[PDB]
């Protein structure tokens, strides 16, 4: 069957305005592997992201880690957006410090 992605967003370091950090988005438990994951700044896609090669667990569901270097500020909003065949609309999970 088709399994819907779980999405977890978290920073590598404590959020401090003006200090360089990394934002992680871990997307897991989905099937099939066709997926669109994007990290967002103020609702816009971030190009300078890195992601793990596709992998899967013992139940054959897939998982991916995304991360990007960012500098948090008071005005900037960051998020992880996922689209998948199981989702009626893209799911956006905002990061909150």
């Amino acid at each position: 069957i088709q399994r819907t992605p779980k999405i977890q967003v978290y920073s590598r370091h404590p959020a401090e305005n003006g200090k360089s950090n990394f934002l992680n988005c871990y997307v897991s438990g989905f099937h099939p592997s066709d997926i669109e994951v994007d990290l967002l700044k103020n609702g816009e896609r971030i190009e300078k992201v890195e992601h793990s090669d596709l992998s899967f667990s013992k139940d054959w569901s897939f998982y991916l880690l995304y991360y990007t270097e960012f500098t948090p500020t008071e005005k900037d909003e960051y998020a992880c957006r996922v689209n998948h065949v199981t989702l009626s609309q893209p799911k956006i999970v905002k990061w909150d410090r």
């Binding site: 069957i1 088709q2 399994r3 977890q8 978290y10 920073s11 590598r12 370091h13 404590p14 990394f22 992680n24 871990y26 099937h31 099939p32 592997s33 066709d34 890195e50 793990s52 090669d53 596709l54 992998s55 899967f56 054959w60 569901s61 897939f62 880690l65 991360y67 410090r97």
Partner: protein, 280 residues
């Protein structure tokens, strides 16, 4: 240690329609990716300085040639035995490799899934279809059991002999990485409100390696019973992340602290007291 250790090669490919497919492959030492695959040039990507795992360039080149021959044969056979558009798209997953048990006994495996369900596996010297995958599984195993005997023998030797030798060579070549200690940092935050007059306390622990870690919410030496530990989540660069959370009533959060123990800390636990809005 007595811990079991594994090496896996995985393959994921999907046919969007009868004549178009895409695929990816990689190699993993436990949960650490050690190898990629460049599908254009059809060659192994070595992700670490120690990723050749004490194998010679000739051994690795022969393995590369083997994988390319496998991909060529797989493509030709799927094209010949494909063509109803209702069967597409479909996705295949392959997981092959070995597990080394505590005494040194190797165990090889080769497992395949189709559309997220078990399809078949390699048992001793036989391709065994999964019952749940019905006639397709039987068909594929028939082809593998009766038309590619050399393939069966090659797979047997790869997962029972080549794989454990490579796995241990990787552990040796990478000994300064696999035995490293990386100290975490920790910090507190508020989580989603449990309800009116309640607080969610969050202790973040980030950047630790290896994975065993101890984190708890405490009042003095007493562990708090409501503490929930999240999934241990990956950071880039091989380290891990964990959130420990506790719901408490407003007016009862003062005096609570997060305590972190990890092998890298050499006896000096991290202790953070919840401040919240208590300090003006």
């Amino acid at each position: 240690s007595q811990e079991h250790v594994s090496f896996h090669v995985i393959q994921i490919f999907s046919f969007v329609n009868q004549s178009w497919a895409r695929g990816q492959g990689s190699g993993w030492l436990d949960e650490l990716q050690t190898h990629g695959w460049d599908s254009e040039s059809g060659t192994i990507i070595f992700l670490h300085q120690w990723s050749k795992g004490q194998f010679s360039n000739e051994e690795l080149s022969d393995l590369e040639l083997l994988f390319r021959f496998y991909l060529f044969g797989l493509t030709r056979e799927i094209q010949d035995h494909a063509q109803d558009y209702s069967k597409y798209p479909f996705e295949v997953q392959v997981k092959a490799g070995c597990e080394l048990h505590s005494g040194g006994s190797p165990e090889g495996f080769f497992q395949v899934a189709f559309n997220g369900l078990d399809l078949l596996s390699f048992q001793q010297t036989t391709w065994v279809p999964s019952p749940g995958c019905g006639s397709l599984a039987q068909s594929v195993c028939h082809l593998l059991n009766h038309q590619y005997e050399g393939v069966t023998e090659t797979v047997y030797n790869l997962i029972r002999s080549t794989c454990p030798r490579f796995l241990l060579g990787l552990l040796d070549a990478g000994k300064m990485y696999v035995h490293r200690q990386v100290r975490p940092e920790a910090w507190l935050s508020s989580g989603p409100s449990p309800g009116p007059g309640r607080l969610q306390l969050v202790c973040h622990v980030s950047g630790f390696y290896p994975k065993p870690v101890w984190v708890m919410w405490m009042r003095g030496e007493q562990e708090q019973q409501g503490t929930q530990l999240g999934d241990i989540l990956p950071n880039a660069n091989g380290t891990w992340y964990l959130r420990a959370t506790l719901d408490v009533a407003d007016g009862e959060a003062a005096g609570l602290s997060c305590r972190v123990k990890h092998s890298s800390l050499e006896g000096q636990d991290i202790i953070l007291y919840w401040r919240g809005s208590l300090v003006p």
